[PDB]
Amino acid sequence: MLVKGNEILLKAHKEGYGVGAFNFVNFEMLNAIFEAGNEENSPLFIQASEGAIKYMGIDMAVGMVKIMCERYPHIPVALHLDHGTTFESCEKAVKAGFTSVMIDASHHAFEENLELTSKVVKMAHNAGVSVEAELGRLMGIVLVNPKEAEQFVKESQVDYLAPAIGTSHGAFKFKGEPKLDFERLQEVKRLTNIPLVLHGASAIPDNVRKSYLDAGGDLKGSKGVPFEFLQESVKGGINKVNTDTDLRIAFIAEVRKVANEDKSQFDLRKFFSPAQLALKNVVKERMKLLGSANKI
Amino acid sequence: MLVKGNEILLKAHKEGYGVGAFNFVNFEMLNAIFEAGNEENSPLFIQASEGAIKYMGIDMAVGMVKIMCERYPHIPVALHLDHGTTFESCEKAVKAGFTSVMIDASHHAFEENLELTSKVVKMAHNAGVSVEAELGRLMGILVNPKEAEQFVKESQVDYLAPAIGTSHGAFKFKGEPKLDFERLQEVKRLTNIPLVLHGASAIPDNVRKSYLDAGGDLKGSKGVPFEFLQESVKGGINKVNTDTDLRIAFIAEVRKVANEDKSQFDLRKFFSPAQLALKNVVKERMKLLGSANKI
Ligand SMILES: [Ca+2]
Ligand SMILES: [Ca+2]
Ligand code: NA
Ligand code: NA
Ligand SMILES: [Zn+2]
Ligand SMILES: [Zn+2]
């Protein structure tokens, strides 16, 4: 039941909840994610970065997802290109069977951003594919400006938007007190009236961290978005919550553990079965937090 | 593309070389094996145990292989059920798209084995799929040649796994490795079909060295020496099952990266090195057995 990106997000937009966008790089990640979705009766946004695609091959990434779809034909799934860097990248994704693409030109000046986003929107929409873009850039305090988002959105005709409001990617998001400009968020939601996307939205739960640190990992100074901020973000109108770091930490936590507690262990399944479980649990909890659960 | 197990194996039988049959449990292993096949221009035998199929799902096991085949459409690949334990297990494999199946009933008595193996053979061959069976039990330090002749003749099986002193695991021999190549040649002679060596990992010194340098523990591990692997192929072994060497080579690199960088949690950083090490174990083995440049 692989479907357009904004079939899922239009629904999320009007009822006002969030849909986790979960990255994967292989079968283990993908399987855990679908099982979560199945267990929480939640829509799924599956996403792969350009790096992830390079690693597995686009034929395999789209191939694996379509096999998971047949297995759980009742879950609405969008397959989403995360941080597309160029038109040709978005275009390859579109030809391979992705149903959503993000074109990230938020490092460009407004006009170049708009110009490339609009080029992407047109071939995307022509093929039945939704598109994300970004305004402002991902560091905290830069921050998006509502009025140009209003304009940016109208001119490009883009399905969803990722306004920077103070998140950044990775395990170390805030050096100071968690700060996110919700007022900014609201103005943008208000002016644009489309699904909004929150990047760098991992939370870094205390159990996930503890699990990593117990296993020998090093996460000094790490700090994600608090569940509270994740919740408030959805009240603000965020409908897509990009989540990646949390999955990887939970996954590697168990790999590190198994490696530690048994030096004669080299059965791969022994390493990745607990890793899958831990990831799946991060995803199930996040689906409930954001309001995705039971939305099927 | 996917082809019948004994299309690959019959060629190996007459031209007198061994084809590695490599086990896989996920994408990383599958990819490594195919690149190795590509880089050495070798025909591929891909296998999945009942346990690996349950782990990934038989839909996904066949799925990724079909994707990997489109990727490398010039490489002959057989997809084989390893240690199928029941008629029902073999039959699901056949319906899912395998091109080969092993029905392992070697733990039964001759007549119970022949009876089940033939049952599998009949439905396999009816779906154009080839069949492997086993005779003797695997255990350090054995098949009976003249029943093998009857077994094969009665069953109409396409290849056979005669036991000659190999066993699964990183610990095949208490002391010095020993295998009965006389049995083998006699079996080959009496049967005149592709033969299969199970428990054939070599546990190369570099792979062991890598795993112990990463803090692994292979106390008392020994596998079949390259020399014996070679002799086996002279004897008439055409298919050499290889799993343990892969996992050790792969897991060593995982262990290393975990030890090397405690803040590292990018999966690809763990699995790219591990794929590379697996691929290299596969490429050397392909050369050793003589599958190399047979495409
Ligand atoms: Ca950006
Ligand atoms: Ca057996
Ligand atoms: Na995205
Ligand atoms: Na086998
Ligand atoms: Zn992002
Ligand atoms: Zn075996």
3-state DSSP assignment of residue A6: helix
- Give the residue from chain B lying closest to A24, CA to CA: B267
Could you tell me which of B163, B105, B166 has the C-alpha nearest to residue B136? B163
Please tell me the CATH code under which domain B1-295 is placed: 3.20.20.70
CA distance B196 to chain A (A): 23
C-alpha dihedral over B170, B175, B176, B181, to 10 degrees?
-70
Note the ligand closest to the C-alpha atom of B172.
Answer: 6
Helices marked H in A75-145: 87-96, 110-127
Whether the Cβ atoms of residue A76 and residue A50 lie closer than 8 Å to each other: no
Breaks (C-N over 2.5 A) in chain A follow: 141
Find the residue in B nearest to A222 (Cα). Answer: B263
* Whole-number Cα distances in Å, A150 to A79, A107, A187, A193, A239: 26, 18, 9, 9, 17
> Rounded CA gap, A217 and B272, in Å?
20
CA of A282 to the centre of ligand 3 (A): 19
Interatomic CA distance for residues B67 and A160, integer angstroms: 32
Enter the DSSP assignment of A223: B
Contact A277, B294 (CB under 8 A): no
CA distances from B111 to B106, B137, B153, B250 (A): 10, 15, 13, 40
Query: What letter would DSSP give residue B81?
Result: E
Provide the experimental method for this PDB entry: X-ray
Pairing of the two strands A77-84 and A44-49: parallel
Closest residue in B to A172 (Cα) is B263
Rounded Cα distance, A257 and A213, in Å: 10
CB-CB: which of A59, A70, A273 is closest to B67? A59
Domain boundaries, chain A: 1-296
User: Was domain A1-296 assigned CATH 1.10.1740.10?
Assistant: no
Inspect the interface and report whether the beta carbons of B60 and A51 lie closer than 8 Å: no
Query: Which of the ligands is closest to the CA of residue B98?
Result: 4
Residue A159: DSSP 8-state = S
3-state secondary structure of B196: strand
Chain B residues touching A71 at Cβ < 8 A: 57, 59-60
Question: B265 and A259 in contact by Cβ < 8 A?
Answer: no
- Selection from B90, B95, B86, B65 nearest residue B3 by Cα: B65
Q: List B84's β-bridge partners, or say none.
A: B103
CB atoms closer than 10 angstroms to residue B192: 11
Protein residues within 5 Å, CB atom, of ion ligand 1: A 104, 106
Q: Which residues of A are catalytic?
A: 82
State whether B263 and A28 contact (CB < 8 Å).
no
Tell me the shortest Cα–Cα distance from A156 to chain B, in angstroms. Answer: 34
Whether A268 and B250 lie within 8 Å, measured CB to CB: yes
| A192 annotated among ligand-binding-site residues | no
Amino acid found at A249 = I
Q: Which of A27, A51, A265 sits opposite B56 (nearest CB)?
A: A27
Per the document, the length of chain B is 295
Instruction: Return the CA Rg of chain A.
Output: 18
